[PDB]
Every structure is written in C-alpha cells, then in structure tokens.
C-alpha cells in the first residue's frame, strides 16, 4: 500500500522480482531451458592503455600559470582543417561505411 517508495526489484512476487532488475545493460539472451547465452561481442571490453613512460600525474603544480578559457567551437577547429584547404587554390559524405559514426552515434563514451 506504499506509493512513495521506489519500485525496485526487491518488492514483488517471484515472477516480478526476477524480471525487473537494476540498470544492468544486459549481455545475452535466454534459450529454451532457461539457458543463458553470454555473447562475447556484447560484453564491453575495456580499451586500457599502458602507462609506463607517461609524464602526467593526477594533479598539476601551482606554479603553472592562470589561463583563460576557450570553448572549442566548431568554427575554431575548422581553422585547423585549413592546412590542405589553402593549397587547393578532410570530409566524409556518409557514416554508413564508418565504424564510429557521429550522428547515429555508433560508439560509447
């Protein structure tokens, strides 16, 4: 009879508790014996680099100067798409053949 409580997985009966779950972003699917099939391709693997020989640390020092911001507008970055675009006197038409599509955003983070 409680309305203002959040509806989490812990609340309903057996059929209800197993369905909802938390914000998992699940991986595979269920086949015919309640047999789960974990897809390796849908598991997010991490792209972690190596860090040896790397000059940066989580903090900077105070002796570094104060500087003013520059929100990098699309106008600004076109002015460094100019280094071949002054010699003619970089663009992709679609993203169907691209693997990291921009507007129908194919990638993650």
């Amino acid at each position: 009879a409680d309305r203002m409580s959040k509806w989490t997985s812990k609340r309903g009966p057996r059929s209800f508790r197993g369905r909802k779950g938390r914000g998992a972003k699940g991986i595979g699917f269920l086949t015919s014996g309640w047999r789960f099939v974990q897809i390796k391709e849908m598991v997010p693997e991490f792209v972690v680099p190596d860090l040896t020989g790397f000059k940066l640390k989580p903090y900077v020092s105070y002796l570094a100067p104060e500087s003013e911001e520059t929100p990098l507008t699309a106008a600004q970055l076109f002015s460094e798409a100019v280094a071949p675009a002054i010699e003619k006197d970089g663009f992709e038409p679609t993203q169907e053949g691209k693997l990291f599509q921009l507007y129908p955003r194919n990638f993650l983070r």
Binding site: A74, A75, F78, A81, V82, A85, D89, F91
Partner: peptide
Amino acid sequence: VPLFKIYVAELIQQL
C-alpha cells in the same frame, strides 16, 4: 547540411 561545406564556402569565398 554539415558545417564543413558552409565553412569551406566561406574560405573559398575568402580567396
């Protein structure tokens, strides 16, 4: 339209 074709048409016009 992508803003490439606008901004290159403002630079070709700048030449």
